[PDB]
């Protein structure tokens, strides 16, 4: 799933 570490992944998607 989306990686919380990522800045864009968290900025657009929510942390797993």
Swiss-Prot record:
Site (Pharmacophore key residue): 3, 8
Result of changing residue 8 to Q: 70-fold decrease in ability to block Nav1.4. Block of Nav1.2 is completely reversible
Annotated consequence of substituting residue 8 to E: 200-fold decrease in ability to block Nav1.4. Block of Nav1.2 is completely reversible
Cysteine disulfide partners in this protein: 1-9, 1-15, 1-16, 2-9, 2-15, 4-15, 4-16
Phenotypic consequence of residue 10 to A: Decrease in ability to block both Nav1.4 and Nav1.2, and decrease in binding affinity for Nav1.2, Nav1.4, and Nav1.7
Protein name: Mu-conotoxin KIIIA
Modification Cysteine amide, positions: 16
Protein source organism: Conus kinoshitai (Kinoshita's cone)
Region feature (Pharmacophore key residues): 10-12, 14-15
Site location (Pharmacophore key residue, the side chain functions like a cork in the bottleneck, with the positively charged amine group preventing the penetration of sodium): 7
Outcome reported for the amino acid change (mutating residue 1 to A): Structure similar to wild-type toxin, even with this disulfide bond deletion
């Amino acid at each position: 799933c989306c990686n919380c570490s990522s800045k864009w992944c968290r900025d657009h998607s929510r942390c797993c």
